[PDB]
Design a protein around this ligand. Structure first.
Ligand SMILES: COC(=O)c1ccc(O)cc1
Ligand SMILES: Nc1nnc2ccccn12
Ligand SMILES: [Cl-]
Ligand SMILES: [Cl-]
Length: 163
């Protein structure tokens, strides 16, 4: 575990993380995909061997010794707000189990279902709160990756509010 487990946020490409493992915002079919998923495919293509997994689950595939945790959030275009919220929470619980199993001291994580799976809505708070619910009981240093300047400020404020 980390000596003083923490949350941090960084505004940069998650493919350039400084953590011991990465969470991919995957699609269920293990395809190269869009956004975070395509950056992860370019950096760790070997990790897409048999990476397909259902919505609400996470599947880890090693690239060398570096773990890629493929976490499948729901596409809110297809799911109801109610069912989507349940699957989004479940995906993060499966990420916490994998991070714990791997014994890493740090993990790089994106906000699941906030990009092309958002159904055209702002889901920063919804996704971040499900991340906290899952990860608060783990002792890994968690570094949350985003790309938007106002998202960085809102994520930073949410972390500091609890400290
Ligand atoms: C924090 O998000 C990313 O790491 C990211 C990488 C590549 C993209 O095209 C989009 C987002
Ligand atoms: N998760 C995330 N980081 N930056 C952005 C920007 C728009 C929508 C989602 N985002
Ligand atoms: Cl960058
Ligand atoms: Cl997304």
């Amino acid at each position: 575990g980390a000596m003083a487990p923490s949350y941090r946020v960084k505004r940069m490409d998650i493919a350039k993380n400084d953590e011991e493992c990465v969470v991919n915002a995957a699609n269920p079919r293990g395809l190269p995909g869009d956004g975070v998923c395509k950056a992860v495919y370019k950096k760790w293509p070997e990790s897409f061997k048999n990476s397909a997994t259902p919505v609400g689950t996470a599947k880890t595939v090693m690239c060398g010794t570096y773990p890629v945790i493929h976490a499948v959030g729901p596409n809110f275009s297809n799911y109801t707000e109610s069912e989507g919220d349940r699957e989004l929470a479940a995906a993060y619980r499966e990420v916490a189990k994998e991070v714990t199993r791997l014994g890493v001291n740090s993990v790089a994580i994106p906000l699941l279902s906030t990009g092309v799976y958002s159904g055209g809505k702002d889901r920063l708070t919804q996704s971040l709160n499900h991340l906290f619910t899952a990860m608060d009981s783990t002792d890994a240093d968690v570094v949350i990756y985003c790309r938007d300047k106002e998202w960085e400020k809102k994520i930073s404020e949410a972390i500091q509010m609890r400290t």
